[PDB]
Amino acid sequence: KVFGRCELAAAMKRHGLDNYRGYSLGNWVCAAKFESNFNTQATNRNTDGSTDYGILQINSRWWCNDGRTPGSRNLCNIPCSALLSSDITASVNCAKKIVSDGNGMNAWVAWRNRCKGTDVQAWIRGCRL
Ligand SMILES: [Br-]
Ligand SMILES: [Br-]
Ligand SMILES: [Br-]
Ligand SMILES: [Br-]
């Protein structure tokens, strides 16, 4: 499913992400826009053989099991296919784990390079939250 901006904002807010670990909703929506373009089914393979999955592009090396990334941990105890779902619950639950891991949202390359230090409020502008 390809979410609308405001639609994803509301689903994320409903899932407890607004100000989670201090990150405003604007950050989460900006991250998703640049990681998957709001597409739950996005997947991208990395040079190390790991694959990123879903709306927030969660990596198979540490967070989920895809049956093909040797030596991987499944810190979120979930198959990576669960992350491609129209219901964002699994992606949100795993993300909360990632962001509490130490580096915060710098764990997402697109966030660091394209969202960090920008007016993220613009991402939630005009939405009925
Ligand atoms: Br947009
Ligand atoms: Br915001
Ligand atoms: Br949802
Ligand atoms: Br932090």
Side-chain angles (χ1 to χ4, degrees), residues 24-26 120-121 124:
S24 65
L25 237 194
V120 295
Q121 309 177 122
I124 57 168

Short mmCIF file of all heavy atoms in Angstrom, two decimals, residues 24-26 120-121 124, ligand 2:
data_model
loop_
_atom_site.label_atom_id
_atom_site.label_comp_id
_atom_site.label_asym_id
_atom_site.label_seq_id
_atom_site.Cartn_x
_atom_site.Cartn_y
_atom_site.Cartn_z
N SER A 24 9.79 14.15 16.93
CA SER A 24 8.46 14.60 16.53
C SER A 24 7.93 13.81 15.32
O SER A 24 8.73 13.24 14.55
CB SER A 24 8.49 16.11 16.21
OG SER A 24 9.31 16.45 15.09
N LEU A 25 6.60 13.76 15.19
CA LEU A 25 5.96 13.02 14.09
C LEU A 25 6.55 13.41 12.74
O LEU A 25 6.74 12.54 11.88
CB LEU A 25 4.44 13.26 14.05
CG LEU A 25 3.42 12.09 14.12
CD1 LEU A 25 2.05 12.62 13.71
CD2 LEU A 25 3.82 10.91 13.26
N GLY A 26 6.86 14.70 12.57
CA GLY A 26 7.44 15.20 11.35
C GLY A 26 8.66 14.40 10.94
O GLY A 26 8.83 14.15 9.75
N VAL A 120 11.19 19.69 9.63
CA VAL A 120 10.32 18.50 9.55
C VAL A 120 8.83 18.73 9.80
O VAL A 120 7.99 17.92 9.41
CB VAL A 120 10.83 17.38 10.47
CG1 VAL A 120 12.20 16.88 9.99
CG2 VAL A 120 10.89 17.87 11.91
N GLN A 121 8.50 19.86 10.43
CA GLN A 121 7.12 20.21 10.69
C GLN A 121 6.37 20.25 9.36
O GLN A 121 5.20 19.88 9.30
CB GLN A 121 7.05 21.58 11.36
CG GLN A 121 7.95 21.72 12.57
CD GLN A 121 7.92 23.13 13.17
OE1 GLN A 121 7.60 23.32 14.36
NE2 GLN A 121 8.23 24.14 12.35
N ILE A 124 3.99 17.40 8.34
CA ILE A 124 2.67 17.18 8.94
C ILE A 124 1.72 18.37 8.72
O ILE A 124 0.56 18.35 9.16
CB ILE A 124 2.75 16.79 10.45
CG1 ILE A 124 3.49 17.85 11.24
CG2 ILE A 124 3.52 15.48 10.61
CD1 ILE A 124 3.35 17.66 12.74
BR BR B 2 6.84 17.79 13.57
#
